[PDB]
Amino acid sequence: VWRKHYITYRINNYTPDMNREDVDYAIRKAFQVWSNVTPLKFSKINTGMADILVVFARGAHGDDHAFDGKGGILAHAFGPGSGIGGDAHFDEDEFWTTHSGGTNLFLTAVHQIGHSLGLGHSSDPKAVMFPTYKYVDINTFRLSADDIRGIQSLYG
Ligand SMILES: CC(=O)N[C@@H]1[C@@H](O)[C@H](O)[C@@H](CO)O[C@H]1n1cc(CN([C@@H](C(=O)O)C(C)C)S(=O)(=O)c2ccc(-c3ccccc3)cc2)nn1
Numbered sequence: 001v002w003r004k005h006y007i008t009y010r011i012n013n014y015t016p017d018m019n020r021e022d023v024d025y026a027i028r029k030a031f032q033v034w035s036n037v038t039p040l041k042f043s044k045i046n047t048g049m050a051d052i053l054v055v056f057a058r059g060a061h062g063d064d065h066a067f068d069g070k071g072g073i074l075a076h077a078f079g080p081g082s083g084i085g086g087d088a089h090f091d092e093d094e095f096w097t098t099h100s101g102g103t104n105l106f107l108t109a110v111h112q113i114g115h116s117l118g119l120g121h122s123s124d125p126k127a128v129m130f131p132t133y134k135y136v137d138i139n140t141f142r143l144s145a146d147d148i149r150g151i152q153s154l155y156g
């Protein structure tokens with residue numbers, strides 16, 4: 001688990017799929033999902049070393065877990081720790097979108113951030129930490145009880 005409650009993140013690079021403001025906005029909103037139900041606070045930084053580095057990359061990208069082209073694996077993230085720990089990577093060969101029509105960035109980022117914070121997967125198809133991606137209505141997006149129980153048992 002992170003052994004602090006103030007956690008920074010940095011966006012390493014941007015996908016050409018979406019407007020930058022939409023990337024910023026999806027990432028910022030995905031952190032809010034988790035800071036709304038825990039005592040964690042997340043700050044974006046623009047220089048220096050962040051706890052959570054957000055990367056868009058294709059294929060092999062230097063961490064011994066290469067991506068696989070369009071389809072299959074969408075993204076992955078490392079559990080809490082220094083260095084690469086916490087970092088969240090998105091497969092650039094996906095087509096990242098603000099709504100539907102590709103792979104939704106916001107929803108995928110919520111799921112990945114859950115792993116950066118120390119969460120495993122849920123057996124609840126309504127949970128964001130469910131292992132399978134589906135587009136759900138963002139307007140009615142809510143964490144499930146199982147998400148809330150898991151994050152709260154790590155962080156309060
Ligand atoms: C054991 C298993 O899950 N096998 C399937 C296998 O069933 C599937 O056919 C294959 C396709 O290549 O992907 C395999 N797969 C998927 C994954 C999970 N993926 C990663 C992850 O959990 O974050 C990992 C790489 C870290 S993942 O597939 O990339 C992934 C990423 C995000 C989500 C998600 C969930 C809820 C909301 C929004 C997005 C779902 C899946 N791992 N292995």
Ligand SMILES: [Ca+2]
Pocket residue numbers: 050051052053081082083084085086087
């Ligand atoms: Ca890190």
Ligand SMILES: [Ca+2]
Pocket residue numbers: 067068069070071072073074091093094
């Ligand atoms: Ca892929």
Ligand SMILES: [Ca+2]
Pocket residue numbers: 015017091092093094095096
């Ligand atoms: Ca892409």
Ligand SMILES: [Zn+2]
Pocket residue numbers: 061063065076089
């Ligand atoms: Zn990676």
Ligand SMILES: [Zn+2]
Pocket residue numbers: 111115121129130131
């Ligand atoms: Zn997962």
